[PDB]
Design a protein around this ligand. Structure first.
Ligand code: NA
Ligand code: NA
Lengths: 358, 358
């Protein structure tokens, strides 16, 4: 019996920051309206492609683990906002970092995608030859947004987080997990007309709907994550009080609170950074994990509960048993290219087109 | 030790057929030019979305295996042409078929994606709780093509293939596999400007380049598949002559022939259907497997070698040990919706725009 220890962690938040005040200059919103409704104060807007965010997060995780490019046998990029479909963007991260031969694929399960990727990499390593893996959640959600619709435009942001996993005989890393999907929730969170469903030669094809039915998402998310977390805990043999830290998807602080309340988990165990970055889909969990470690929230031998949901409606939970080390082996100097524009300036073309079309 | 037997197989080829003669009515080609160069006589053009092709193939595989919707715990759709990015299309197949709760994700590794999906599902089943899985390769490549460029427009088509896997103690299904990626080949097969790299509000954004460097693809494909097949065989303990059937990606018959020649595998062991369907990316292997079974090419207890490559440049090989049954348990009556248009008529808008832009 083998395990996949989380030996490296890293993040990449692009520098250009879009404040609530910035949003209020082109939408009928206020900092007060956005913060009360969402708990978000800021979010990041990338000046580079998704794959560039993924690359920097990966570099940080690699330095954190001290692994070489030869040692990496598997790369998974969890994303719903890839630069390209042909080829995938895991191969772009691979090209950028000069990693030979590793399997490289993109995994799409919306914001549950990092958890799906962690589950997938862990089992691949347990059942076959893979010695180390790189699992990245990376998104440029700002690509998708309808800048005339305040209820969705204020929720989402860009960023990436990564881990490195290393094979070990010690009982650490992801233990049990339950991942799933409530396909009866498929239509309540969706961009149905970006993809091959869209008309390639319709001049109005950029003005797609971003469907978001908040009350239904809340209900299905709490149900799906809750039952997954229960299945994992029940199988683990831990009592609820033995969970030390919760690392949740960052969609909505009230969902996190309801999840913990219904499970009987103390509210102060859940790591929250939604106020800084908004909902970055697949990136939420790995950024939160990296920052929890940075901030001293996770101790050696802690039990972590990971919980996430996303469009699909995908869902999942996982139990991680931490090992000995909570400190990076090395730091990376890796940085994104210079950002020469403010967030408002980055978004200008899209905002202007969305308004004109309206 | 558990295994993932292939208990169901199925396919969906959309009915609208684009002949070489059809292509010669709008391109500077002839049936003679296309056939001599490519070995392709026909290909299919879908009148429906990728997810609809995936659904029908899945229905056939499900009837073939006799599994219920409750029994299915995992759905992977291997595709580079999904209807949507938010949500994924595995969740659409799940919705269409009323499969509760199963994990559902899209996997992008270009034409090697079905093999990646088979590897992934098999190891998930071996290392954790998943009892049955649905793995689908499905593509609508016709969405992407530059109808003014004869060297690429004649190569690609649409379709889907599926398998059902079932957990067993018997040593059957995928045994060893080696999947990988030569990221030095990333730029020789690519559509860099469909995805979030594209300008959403550029009116010319539909007129993207389809990069295809044939000689370089050939070289890297033979190298990558060849070495993967060798690693699998060497680890298997089989001699080369003990491989009964080869199920290869259908990109180019000369690649298949070179692969077998260099490995010392008899040419008549490789199943070929490229003449009927062209290159359907992730769908090639599962359609070929389904048709090999249909046509009596695979016997109980055969050793199969699967080999594939795709944009990335992704690559892989796998050894499958067949079990007892090569016959479906049941047939499905599932059909696509009525196709009211010829292939030429389906493509008319895109051809006309590509020509006008030129
Ligand atoms: Na504990
Ligand atoms: Na044999």
């Amino acid at each position: 019996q083998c395990y996949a220890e989380i030996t490296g962690w890293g993040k990449c938040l692009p520098p250009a920051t879009l404040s609530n005040h910035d949003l209020s200059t082109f939408l009928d919103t206020s900092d007060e309206w956005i913060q009360s409704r969402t708990g978000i104060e800021q979010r990041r807007i990338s000046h580079v492609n998704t794959s560039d965010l993924a690359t920097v997060a990966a570099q940080h995780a690699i330095a954190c683990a001290g692994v070489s490019v030869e040692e990496i046998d598997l790369i998974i990029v969890a994303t719903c906002s890839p630069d390209s479909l042909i080829p995938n963007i895991a191969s772009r991260v691979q090209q950028n970092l000069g990693i030979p031969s590793a399997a490289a694929f993109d995994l799409n399960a919306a914001a549950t995608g990092f958890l799906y990727g962690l589950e997938t990499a862990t089992r691949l390593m347990q059942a076959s030859h893979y010695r180390h893996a790189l699992v990245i959640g990376a998104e440029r959600l700002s690509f998708y947004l309808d800048w005339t619709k305040r209820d969705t435009a204020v929720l989402f942001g860009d960023g990436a987080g990564a881990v490195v996993l290393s094979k070990t005989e010690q009982k650490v890393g992801l233990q049990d997990a339950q991942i799933g999907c409530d396909a009866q929730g498929r239509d309540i969170l969706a961009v149905p007309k970006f993809g091959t469903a869209m008309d390639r030669f319709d001049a109005d094809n950029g003005y797609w709907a971003f469907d978001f039915v908040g009350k239904e998402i809340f209900k299905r998310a709490v149900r799906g994550m809750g039952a997954a977390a229960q299945q994992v805990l029940a199988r683990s043999g831990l009592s609820t009080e033995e969970i030390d830290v919760v690392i949740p998807h960052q969609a909505n602080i009230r969902i996190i609170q309801t999840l913990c309340d219904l499970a009987g988990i103390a509210q102060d165990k859940a790591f929250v950074n939604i106020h800084r970055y908004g909902n970055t889909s697949a990136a939420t969990v790995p950024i939160a994990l990296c920052e929890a470690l940075e901030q001293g929230k996770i101790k050696p031998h802690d039990d972590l509960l990971v919980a996430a949901f996303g469009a699909g409606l995908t869902w999942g939970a996982g139990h991680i048993r931490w090992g000995e080390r909570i400190t990076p082996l090395g730091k990376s100097d890796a940085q994104l290219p210079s950002c020469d524009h403010t967030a408002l300036d980055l978004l200008s073309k899209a905002i202007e087109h969305c308004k004109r079309h309206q």
